[PDB]
Design a protein around this nucleic acid. Structure first.
Ligand SMILES: [Mg+2]
Ligand SMILES: [Mg+2]
Ligand SMILES: [Mg+2]
Ligand SMILES: [Mg+2]
Ligand SMILES: [Mg+2]
Ligand SMILES: [Mg+2]
Ligand SMILES: [Mg+2]
Ligand SMILES: [Mg+2]
Ligand SMILES: [Mg+2]
Ligand SMILES: [Mg+2]
Ligand SMILES: [Mg+2]
Ligand SMILES: [Mg+2]
Ligand SMILES: [Mg+2]
Ligand SMILES: [Mg+2]
Ligand SMILES: [Mg+2]
Ligand SMILES: [Mg+2]
Ligand SMILES: [Mg+2]
Ligand SMILES: [Mg+2]
Ligand SMILES: [Mg+2]
Ligand SMILES: [Mg+2]
Ligand SMILES: [Mg+2]
Ligand SMILES: [Mg+2]
Ligand SMILES: [Mg+2]
Ligand SMILES: [Mg+2]
Ligand SMILES: [Mg+2]
Ligand SMILES: [Mg+2]
Ligand SMILES: [Mg+2]
Ligand SMILES: [Mg+2]
Ligand SMILES: [Mg+2]
Ligand SMILES: [Mg+2]
Ligand SMILES: [Mg+2]
Ligand SMILES: [Mg+2]
Ligand SMILES: [Mg+2]
Ligand SMILES: [Mg+2]
Ligand SMILES: [Mg+2]
Ligand SMILES: [Mg+2]
Ligand SMILES: [Mg+2]
Ligand SMILES: [Mg+2]
Ligand SMILES: [Mg+2]
Ligand SMILES: [Mg+2]
Ligand SMILES: [Mg+2]
Ligand SMILES: [Mg+2]
Ligand SMILES: [Mg+2]
Ligand SMILES: [Mg+2]
Ligand SMILES: [Mg+2]
Ligand SMILES: [Mg+2]
Ligand SMILES: [Mg+2]
Ligand SMILES: [Mg+2]
Ligand SMILES: [Mg+2]
Ligand SMILES: [Mg+2]
Ligand SMILES: [Mg+2]
Ligand SMILES: [Mg+2]
Ligand SMILES: [Mg+2]
Ligand SMILES: [Mg+2]
Ligand SMILES: [Mg+2]
Ligand SMILES: [Mg+2]
Ligand SMILES: [Mg+2]
Ligand SMILES: [Mg+2]
Ligand SMILES: [Mg+2]
Ligand SMILES: [Mg+2]
Ligand SMILES: [Mg+2]
Ligand SMILES: [Mg+2]
Ligand SMILES: [Mg+2]
Ligand SMILES: [Mg+2]
Ligand SMILES: [Mg+2]
Ligand SMILES: [Mg+2]
Ligand SMILES: [Mg+2]
Ligand SMILES: [Mg+2]
Ligand SMILES: [Mg+2]
Ligand SMILES: [Mg+2]
Ligand SMILES: [Mg+2]
Ligand SMILES: [Mg+2]
Ligand SMILES: [Mg+2]
Ligand SMILES: [Mg+2]
Ligand SMILES: [Mg+2]
Lengths: 275, 114, 68, 88, 100
RNA sequence: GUGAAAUGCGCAGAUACCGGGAGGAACGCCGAUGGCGAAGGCAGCCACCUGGUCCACCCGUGACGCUGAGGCGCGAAAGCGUGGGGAGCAAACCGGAUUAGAUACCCGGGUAGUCCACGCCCUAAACGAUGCGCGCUAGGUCUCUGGGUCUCCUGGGGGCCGAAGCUA
């Protein structure tokens, strides 16, 4: 679902919350958390370098397994599916028969109690991992490595996936969640299925304070500043842009492409995103 | 240059285009009613199709063409006339097949076809 | 020139009987009418329902070029 | 569907004498199965509206029998809907 | 429990080893979904009406079976899973209907 | 491309042709004066789930019936909400034409929408312009689908033509 609220405060009127339906364990595997050092957007010089962040609820990092080829053939039971404060998607607790425990992004479909496994010879059911080369074309897939043995990098957000579109020699071809067509290496793992919690997009924060709980401090318009402050700053009264609309640092911000012209990964991108 | 090959006869209402191809299917030369000289609706006539199929064979024959299979597409005017024209050109006409593309109820047509 | 005649016993629901069936298609592959097959109403339906099934399996065409 | 025997088991379960088919009691019971199995079919297939019509007809039929049977023999009715779990 | 006719078309350019192997996966699979094979008509190669998988020939199989109703569908998916199976059709079996 | 044109596309290589790929929508032939549904309506093929309905047997219940103000449910298209999807088509809108003019008809473009999910809307030439059920009052022919002793007879549908009779 997604959960509405009777409009008993003016904020409650619109605010929606996640349904938490698929979640079954409310404490994280003690042995799998480590504390996340909050940054507040500031780097090692101490300087803010990403604006308006800070003051979010405290979190523990849940150690996630983005490799999986780590343990080929060793199968595993899906113990629980839990909330993770650090991602949109949910995480699944795996008890390997080995006795090792690990956390994975819960794919949409995964039913607690089921079993899963990774390796070239894995069955093509939800939750399993294999090299892309051994994944049937047309199947939708998540958590994809971008280069071998380098860790899942693609489609990890609640409800994302990719689609295998055909192979060509060493590489295979994905429609990345964004629509881009890219060649990924065949030896890159991916997990079958698409990421769960796919309703995540339909959440209505509802009030300033929720944006605050999430570590997001208020954002101020270039329009609302002074000229020392921002390209758009000043004018007596309101003002339009009076110039092509820009970031605080002066660069145009409508339409201006920004990817490096000569990037080597260009050779492997087939069709830039759409829409 | 090749001895044998193909002939494609596009027969619309507004025109007839004819391309002569190689064995595998890649073009050697083509023509249409416009090329032989007509503009506007005269391109749609059987005479136009005639000249165009003729000029088509002629142009092909100069690259050595002798045998051709003929693919006819489209319920046009200069359809059949274009066929005559081909035979009478001094080209073999090894066979004649209609391969007009037609939907098994595909896309919605323009208003004009409903 | 009635097709129903030209063949002895034939099962209508045999979607594999590629030999019988193929006699019911025009030279362009279009499934033939009763005015050419000689089927009654009911027969006709069963035949058509199975020809199509064949075409799906790969044994009968969906379409074929007209030759002259 | 409904298995032919399952029909029977009910046919038998509700019948008034070991020859009985199509009495009030039996019809009611039999219906009650076609209803309940459909009720379920619909719980899943919500968009199957026509089949709801059927259910709607079926329920009505059953209501009729019940009204009759209740007129003729209160305790026989009181029992039947008890046995099928009904008056809610 | 009902009588069906699982048809299946496999890759034509398989060696009799490969082909056999697919046949195993198939035969296990039927068993795994609780098919019970009755007849079984392996008809091998055959020229097709049209190029399936861009390939004029097709290696045919056919299995009459008595399996549970509910499971039949899942079987078909599972059958199709292989880069080598090229059609699967699973028909409810019926009494021949004859002309003449 | 049209009545003929023009806009448009095309030497920055279009059309026409061959091969690979992507995607969405509708299912040609069969197809019908056809079938199904209470209506709206329903069309490639497969399987699962499920409703209505007809026949035959004449086995059971024993008037349990008909109708139906309110209620409740369904209800084409267009339209709304949330989110997908978007090939073809296409209101709006741009342009070319036709014309006295042409906010149209024709032509080249084109966004909602058309498609999916879920939720609303509740309309119509939603028509047989014909409310439901039951009984009675010539036939003739065509047809779909059952049953028979299979010439033909007997049920249930869809047409036509007509007894009597109604009818302005
Ligand atoms: Mg949910
Ligand atoms: Mg609420
Ligand atoms: Mg709310
Ligand atoms: Mg509340
Ligand atoms: Mg208030
Ligand atoms: Mg308020
Ligand atoms: Mg959440
Ligand atoms: Mg959840
Ligand atoms: Mg805690
Ligand atoms: Mg610790
Ligand atoms: Mg940390
Ligand atoms: Mg430090
Ligand atoms: Mg320092
Ligand atoms: Mg600071
Ligand atoms: Mg910043
Ligand atoms: Mg900050
Ligand atoms: Mg989460
Ligand atoms: Mg959104
Ligand atoms: Mg939002
Ligand atoms: Mg937080
Ligand atoms: Mg923000
Ligand atoms: Mg602001
Ligand atoms: Mg401003
Ligand atoms: Mg300003
Ligand atoms: Mg100011
Ligand atoms: Mg300054
Ligand atoms: Mg300053
Ligand atoms: Mg400045
Ligand atoms: Mg300014
Ligand atoms: Mg200002
Ligand atoms: Mg100011
Ligand atoms: Mg100003
Ligand atoms: Mg001002
Ligand atoms: Mg001022
Ligand atoms: Mg202001
Ligand atoms: Mg200004
Ligand atoms: Mg502005
Ligand atoms: Mg300005
Ligand atoms: Mg790279
Ligand atoms: Mg023209
Ligand atoms: Mg009933
Ligand atoms: Mg009651
Ligand atoms: Mg397949
Ligand atoms: Mg040049
Ligand atoms: Mg092409
Ligand atoms: Mg009709
Ligand atoms: Mg009817
Ligand atoms: Mg009796
Ligand atoms: Mg009413
Ligand atoms: Mg409606
Ligand atoms: Mg609509
Ligand atoms: Mg609309
Ligand atoms: Mg609007
Ligand atoms: Mg909409
Ligand atoms: Mg809006
Ligand atoms: Mg939308
Ligand atoms: Mg205009
Ligand atoms: Mg004008
Ligand atoms: Mg205009
Ligand atoms: Mg237009
Ligand atoms: Mg258009
Ligand atoms: Mg809108
Ligand atoms: Mg009304
Ligand atoms: Mg009408
Ligand atoms: Mg009527
Ligand atoms: Mg009136
Ligand atoms: Mg009215
Ligand atoms: Mg009424
Ligand atoms: Mg009246
Ligand atoms: Mg009859
Ligand atoms: Mg008969
Ligand atoms: Mg009649
Ligand atoms: Mg009459
Ligand atoms: Mg009279
Ligand atoms: Mg009157």
């Amino acid at each position: 679902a997604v959960k509405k609220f009777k409009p008993y405060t003016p904020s409650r009127r619109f605010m929606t919350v996640a349904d938490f339906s698929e979640i079954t364990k409310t404490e994280p595997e003690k042995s799998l958390v480590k504390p996340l050092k909050k940054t507040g957007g500031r780097n090692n010089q101490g300087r803010i370098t990403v604006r308006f962040r800070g003051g979010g609820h405290k979190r523990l990092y849940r150690i996630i397994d983005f490799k999986r080829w780590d343990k080929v053939g060793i199968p595993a039971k899906v113990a629980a599916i839990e909330y993770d404060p650090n991602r949109s998607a949910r995480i699944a607790l795996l008890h390997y028969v080995d006795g090792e425990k690990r956390y994975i992004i819960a794919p949409d479909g995964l039913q607690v109690g089921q079993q899963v496994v990774a390796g070239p010879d894995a069955p093509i059911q939800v939750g399993n991992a294999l090299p892309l080369r051994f994944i049937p074309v047309g199947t939708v897939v998540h958590a994809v490595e971008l280069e071998p043995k380098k860790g899942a990098k693609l489609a990890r957000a609640a409800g994302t996936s990719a689609q295998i579109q055909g192979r060509e020699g060493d590489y295979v071809i994905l429609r990345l969640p964004s629509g881009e067509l890219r060649k990924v290496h065949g030896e890159c793992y991916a997990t079958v299925g698409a990421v769960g919690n796919a309703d995540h997009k339909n959440i209505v924060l509802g009030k300033a304070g929720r944006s605050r709980w999430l570590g997001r401090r208020p954002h101020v318009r270039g329009a609302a500043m002074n000229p020392v402050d921002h390209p758009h700053g000043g004018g007596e009264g309101r003002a339009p842009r009076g110039r092509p609309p820009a970031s605080p640092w002066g660069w145009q911000t409508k339409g201006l492409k920004t990817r490096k012209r000569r990037k080597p990964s260009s050779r492997f991108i087939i069709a830039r995103r759409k829409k | 240059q090749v001895a044998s090959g193909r002939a494609y006869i596009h027969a619309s209402y507004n025109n007839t285009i004819v391309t002569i191809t190689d064995p595998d299917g890649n073009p050697i030369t083509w023509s249409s009613g416009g090329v032989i000289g007509y503009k506007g609706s005269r391109k749609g006539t059987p005479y136009a199709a005639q000249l165009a199929a003729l000029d088509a064979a002629k142009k092909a024959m100069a690259y050595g063409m002798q045998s051709v299979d003929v693919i006819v597409r489209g319920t046009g005017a200069g359809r059949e006339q274009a066929i005559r024209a081909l035979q009478a050109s001094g080209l073999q006409v090894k066979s004649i097949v209609d391969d007009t593309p037609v939907p098994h109820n595909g896309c919605r047509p323009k208003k004009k076809f409903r | 020139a009635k097709v129903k005649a030209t063949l002895g016993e034939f099962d209508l629901r045999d979607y594999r009987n590629v030999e019988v069936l193929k006699r019911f298609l025009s030279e362009t592959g279009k499934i033939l009418p009763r005015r050419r097959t000689g089927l009654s109403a009911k027969e006709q339906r069963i035949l058509a329902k199975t020809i199509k099934r064949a075409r799906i399996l790969g044994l009968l065409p969906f379409t074929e070029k007209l030759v002259r | 569907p409904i298995t032919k025997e399952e029909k029977q088991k009910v046919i038998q379960e509700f019948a008034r004498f070991p020859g009985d088919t199509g009495s009030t009691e039996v019809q009611v019971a039999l219906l009650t199965l076609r209803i309940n199995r459909l009720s379920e079919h619909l719980k899943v297939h919500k968009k199957d509206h026509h089949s709801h019509r059927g259910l709607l007809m079926m329920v009505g039929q059953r209501r009729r029998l019940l009204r009759y049977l209740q007129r003729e023999d209160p305790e026989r009715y009181r029992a039947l809907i008890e046995k099928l779990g009904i008056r809610g | 429990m009902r009588r069906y006719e699982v048809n299946i078309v496999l890759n034509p350019n398989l060696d009799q080893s490969q082909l056999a192997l697919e046949k195993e996966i198939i035969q296990r699979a039927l068993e795994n979904y609780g098919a019970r094979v009755e007849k079984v008509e392996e008809l091998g190669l055959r020229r097709l009406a049209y190029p399936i998988a861009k390939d004029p020939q097709g290696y045919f199989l056919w299995y009459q079976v008595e399996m549970p109703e509910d499971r039949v569908n899942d079987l078909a998916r599972e059958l199709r899973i292989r880069d080598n199976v090229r059609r699967v059709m699973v028909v409810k079996s019926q009494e021949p209907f004859l002309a003449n």
